[model samples]
Target: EEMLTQAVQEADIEQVRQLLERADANFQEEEWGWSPLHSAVQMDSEDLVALLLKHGADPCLRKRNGATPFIIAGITGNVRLLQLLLPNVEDVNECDVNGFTAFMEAAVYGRVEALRFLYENGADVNMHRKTKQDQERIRKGGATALMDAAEKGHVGVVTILLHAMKAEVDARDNMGRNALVYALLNPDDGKAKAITRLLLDHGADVNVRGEGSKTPLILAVERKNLDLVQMLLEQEQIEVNDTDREGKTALLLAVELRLEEIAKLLCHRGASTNCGDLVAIARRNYDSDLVKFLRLHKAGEDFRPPAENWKPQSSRWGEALKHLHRIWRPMIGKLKIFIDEEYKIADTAEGGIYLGLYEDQEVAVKRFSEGSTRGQQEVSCLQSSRANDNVVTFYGSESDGSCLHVCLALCEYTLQEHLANHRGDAVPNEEDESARNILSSLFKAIGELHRSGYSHQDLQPQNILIDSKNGTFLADFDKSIKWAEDPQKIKRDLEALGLLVLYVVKKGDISFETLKNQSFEEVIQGSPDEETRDLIHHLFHPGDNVEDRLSSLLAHPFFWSWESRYRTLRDVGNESDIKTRNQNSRILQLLQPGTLSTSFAQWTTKIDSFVMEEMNAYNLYQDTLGDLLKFIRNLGEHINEQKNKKMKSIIGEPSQYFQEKFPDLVMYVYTKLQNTEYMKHFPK
Candidate 1:
């Protein structure tokens, strides 16, 4: 078996054949669960592959990783080798351990010919498969082959799948992202642009909302893909006033990101300024120029250019330009102003919370002292926890050399404040439906946080917030730690949460003596009901593993009964009508007639002027290069004749005149000519 494996690796067909003739020679290899056929295919040896197959090697035999010979051939771009094994392979659509079939693998690696061949052979184009292992990491379980191709910027493969095979243009993954969203979010800017154009031309919905209610246009704007944004805007059917899950519009987002050019375009295209007050949002950023522009549009006054003395401050813009320039420049600039304008709304022990505006949406900004390492930790924690609806949304962050500002979605009040406002008689009854709903939402949030690899080291009532609709939201992660496999940290977080629940129910009336005297089991058993007892057990005693703890908590009747109704209540808060109307009413008084039209026209003129200059220069360069190419082609015949005549004299004898002028040059040219069939044309 070892010898056969060795022969296969070395591509020694003779040795492999001789070894196969032995009666006791086994085809199976232990390493990687590979048979000789799998090894032969991996090495790209067609002859060895055929030999193994002829000896009755199973083409469908998979390795431990579930990579069959058919899948291997496609991944390596071995079309002929794949054709040889295809007939013997039982299932062409067999997938690997990560749920990637030969067809999907071809698309991922941009194997256009192999993908086309597989498509012709009855492979499903819209197959959405994912490995159990990738559930948490990728989140999007049902991603299709078209999404894979679009993500990697495989324009040719995308074209073939969309136009030739007629794959679903708007097929969504588990995360609700479609092929169009994948293309727009691709890392390679050039490929992203190309794939985006192709998908749009093929009738992809520009306004189709995906995960987080984000549309393709909103994503393009968030990604700051100016070219893509322009293309989507050019479409007559594009929804400029569309909102995301956060109720943020394209125009609002553009203004938040400080995308001056995109904002102007959105306004010109009749995007609504009614989603949120543009001027009020701008005022929070301390951006006078932006405020002036937004105010002009609101007031309907004629626009004027900035005065020589009206220079913008370098707050977030300076930091963004220094760091995030290569990723997205226009959007980063706006982010800078957004972070700079935050005003202190509440003070805490470690930091202060400020109310800020982003994308015409209100957000809470947490400001930490300069040089604090917790800033980055908090950012990372929040980023990993964003998928959970119970965790607060992480908008963005910025540093102003003196301090660090972490921005989060704004909530009406903290859990501590909520409890304080409704204490004593105001507090809900222990068995009341409202009380059950609150506890259920809180437990689910903490469970999700732990499951997502975070431990709220400071899990107190003060750090948790209650939204306008009374849903629980966990915030303040400055002291948080990633606790994916840390049992000790997990226990600590659970204990903190346990204490919070006790405090909420007891209304801060429970004595420390009682907590210290009673055992965990005793305290839980003494609880008011079965649901409370079960929750306390899981929280106090996390047992051996996360799965068991999560399973126990998830199975509790308290959570299960309330989970469905909570979802309905949560959606109610997301409605536009429920949003605070005071902000918009105040801005309405500030709007003057004609200001918006004048300011928008002024901004557009500046953008148009810069664009015209660059375009004209680029055109001139192309035309000059065309003229240069024509002159070179005209000289080709004359240059070839002159070169042949000169070559003959050099080949016949080493001329002193040529040797003295260019000795090494003549010798090098002569040596190259003698090595090719071109010698016949040059003569001996």
Candidate 2:
């Protein structure tokens, strides 16, 4: 029996023929319940499989696990083997232990030709199975071949089942999920999309509600698949405003999930936002923007901005800041100061700058009036800018119970000071690369602050700081305001940045009013470089949004040149180091014999420790007793023979050999290793 199985497994055709010629081996089943024919089919030996069938091997014989030769062939995706066994397959719809039919298996494994052949040979396309087991398995409770193919994202199998074989497109499984629902549930990339389009194009119901009364549109929204949602919306018959079992419209669901883009798309398609308590829902979510959108739709107003009328405004800012003063102060603060006499760099009625030590670290202490709005506002803005590197680091705030003290990172000088000192110098020629680096850093810091939903309303050279290391940062967010998608607030920041750039470029020679009056092009006409000119123009451009303008500025040739040159130098150095390491690794792997052996020893030690811990805690050794006994017996015999031959031991004797080998082999090995006498001789 073993000989026949081995011959079939190895595809030794002559040996299989010779063994089959014997009467005892004619159709013997191995211990695994796999007959020679099953083995041959599993091993993908079509010739041997044919010979086994000729020798009267039963194709209908079920393994102990309930899988037949026909199912095995289908599982292996061997088309020829399946073709040979199909004629003898007693029931084409027969299921295995897992309740999966050959037809379902073919669909799941993507055996397109086998699926076609099965359908042509009278296999049921809509066949399903039921199991009495409590646990769920594939096709456990009457899941069809179509559901299997769809769930697995097999587009080819789905097409054949839907178009060629005319399988039920919307067949419901025991769980109340249909083929389209299964397609949506598939986690594969592009599978659901392709299968959905195929199912939709073939007259499958677009609005067919599944488990939870989830329509395809609702499911698409849940999947966060914008393209799928768009496709479903395009179908004229689709009920865009359909509500799920929870009585929530797709638009409401989008809003609840914070799917802004999808909500906007649904609104454009005339999805009724009037359904349900949408305003209440938005209020529950604290989403003012969505609430505003819902209110506009309820008023019978078009919510989407028209291209020609797309001017940004500060209305969103006003909305965002409505409760700012109420909900803003407790978000940040801390205290302590050195107040060095020589560290007084600047002083103002609103604040005084002094060098201080808080937590034993050097920091700039900015003191504001006690119980002042400016101090509170600054703290709120600093809290918003906390996650950004381009902004000054806010180290807690403190109050002497009378005045508010804000601790910030101490820097060498202000941008105003840097510009004042470098005045009357050509930026590119007279200024070093550090000037470009500073500019780049400033743009990035400002861009990050704006992107993080705040605007530096007082963005001027005085509020900008440069550390001794040439790192530039934005400071003093006391005048900053939360700007939520408001282009006007962003425009104000851009104007400030423009003025700062003009001052630095003209070496403080150009007044704010003078630069503000000149056209953007005219101011940049004699710019040192095109990169600078383009950046200055974009900063003043009123048409583009802040995000696009910042992106363009960052992508300028000047920035790219520095970035590309640095990356090239970095990569060249890295490549040489990597090459040397690779060569050393190859030599170590090839020539060092002890390396692999040591790794194996370490792995075995970890496994031994884990197994012993489990055995001691859970008594799980009984679970593996059969294999453990066999290993112990073999090891005992080998060790006994080695001792008799006086050979150097590869492994020590089982200390409690016959006494505790079966009860606790792990402990015996552990105890033997720990024995002081054993360790003295075999120290490792």
Candidate 3:
């Protein structure tokens, strides 16, 4: 054993040869519970390990300690050695006696090279190791290699494990610890907060509950990682009321840690003071700062169980239904306004009026114009309905003699009005902040519409309605087109929407006052901010130089072009099509048999039956397009009607005709699928 160990450790081929000359020099020999090959591999003696394996050393054999040559090489960070030994190994999943596998050891030790090597050789990322015969020993945390790397603050390793090897970030350790919580616990301290920020930025669930229900935010508070706490709270999506197994929330933990600064930040950001078991602690600590902050914000003051168990918070679905009902009547009434002679609302671009009601039942109105086109195209575009709560509601249209009357849901004020009234000569309190909030809401609404396969072509301040009574609603669609067949057109429309949002918020040379008095185009032309200018340059500039920045910006998910399949119109076929109508009827038959499709009002009935159903399908279709297509086809006959006689005669079939008319669209979709990045996961 000693001689074999010496030869293996020395990594001397001559010594190995001399030993082999001995009649007793068999490769099967074990030393210190490890085969001779294991020691050679651990020290990265690749040649020696290879020689032993060739001479009949059992590659599958584990040492008494259960460590394989591959595992030992991984533990010591001998990446090259692991690479050499992996191909000879029988099972990549076999772990050591201590419940560590090659992958886990590499991850825990931050051995990125070793992790890469093992991953390349097909190491089981989620494998568990048994520690004891009766105990059925497993990996310490029951975590994949990715989790261990995350816990050890290995940024490169985590990236490789996640992006390159497709490691699961959400996998739980034995103690139910997740990578997100581990990252929050150990954020990078220096200028390179990239790893921590990257994890958070990538939508890692900061509120993920671990054993004892502990969340990342709770851990941040406990560890007094103020930067991490601030970062988490600053996120647009993190829930403030997220609680852990101990029934402690980030707010409660902050209070316990006496983090007054963090507590104030949390309060300002709408954190719940009475979350978890915080009420008792709040009283005991007499934390006046937190308590007072909460009081000022109208939180943590009341604690009572409603009799008969009534819900304090309103149901989202109920709110939507009520809004639908309220706006339905008002929209019908406003439809008459569009037909009014004075308005001459021909297309989406021609200015018109819109109205809406708030959740609290207050009415408000605005004057706006729709997209870029004109005439019946505008009407057809506006005819499309959405289930989103943000879009302005369309009531019935009335035409009397020479005038056209179109009524709409009334809102509190035009976005133009709010901006004009607020931005007087002097600077106002929280002006920038108010502007940001308004713009944020506008962007979100437009994003919602964009995702729904509708674009707001004429997005100007006047077109936006700020209902103090209701939320913001995108009002004008007179010029907008439905489900753009061209990707470039969609890009242009999205860019325009993004620009309009920035314009309203920044209000550069063209102040709110200017917008109210002057034409929107004139105001936009007169003044612009650096951000808006850059945005426009990105949208309009033709040079390769300008394209570079825009491309980078679009790489980020926030600005990333949503896969069109997820868009509503992409999934919802043409509503006027006989096939769509039939499918709608069939779907109603199966899911809502008693509900009469014709029993409801014309537009109302169509919307009630089809809008929700299409949206439901849209939601499901994003993840499973094949299923959606199958369901749609099974529900009704295929859309075989061809209005294009010329193309139909040439193609002979409806499917072939569609492909011919929309060759560019079909080709674009095919090319998109052909892209290596997109196809790797969603193969064509």
Candidate closest to the true structure, highest lDDT = 2
Tens-digit lDDT track of model 3 for 127-171: 654466544343253556766666678878877777777666666
lDDT by residue for model 1 (1-684), tens: 256787777887788888888622235666668777777777788888778777887788778888888998877777888799899877788888778899988888899888888988989888887677657376747878899899888888998898899898878777777789888778787888889888888788787777688988898889886888888988999888888997788888988877777877888888876666667556766667878877777832332323333222223233322332222223322243232232445777667775554443456678777677788778888888878888888887766667777778767777766666666654332234545556666677788887787888877777778777778888888888877566577787776656655556555456434654667766675565444555676688776665536544544444433333223222322223222322233221222112222222222233223322332321131212112122122222232455345433332321222222232322232233334433332211
Q: Evaluated with TM-score, which candidate comes out highest?
A: 1
For candidate 1, report its TM-score. Answer: 0.45
Error of 1 at 167 (Å): 3.0
Please provide the root mean square deviation of candidate 2 (C-alpha atoms, Å).
Answer: 31.9
Model 3, TM vs. native: 0.38
List RMSD in Å for every model shown: 42.1, 31.9, 30.1
lDDT, residue 563, model 1 = 31
lDDT at 70, model 1: 91
Per-residue lDDT tens digits of candidate 2, residues 271-342? 886655556656677888877877776732423322342221223222222222222122223333444454
Model 3 lowest lDDT segment of ten: 595-604
Superposition-based RMSD of candidate 3 using all C-alpha atoms, in angstroms:
30.1
Better of 2 and 3 by lDDT: 2
Q: What is the lDDT, from 0 to 100, of the residue 365 in candidate 1? A: 71
Point out where model 2 deviates above 4 Å: 1-3, 21-32, 97-99, 133-140, 208-213, 235-249, 269-292, 298-684
lDDT for 229 in candidate 1 is: 86
lDDT of 1: 0.65
lDDT of 3 at 63: 74
TM-score of 2: 0.40
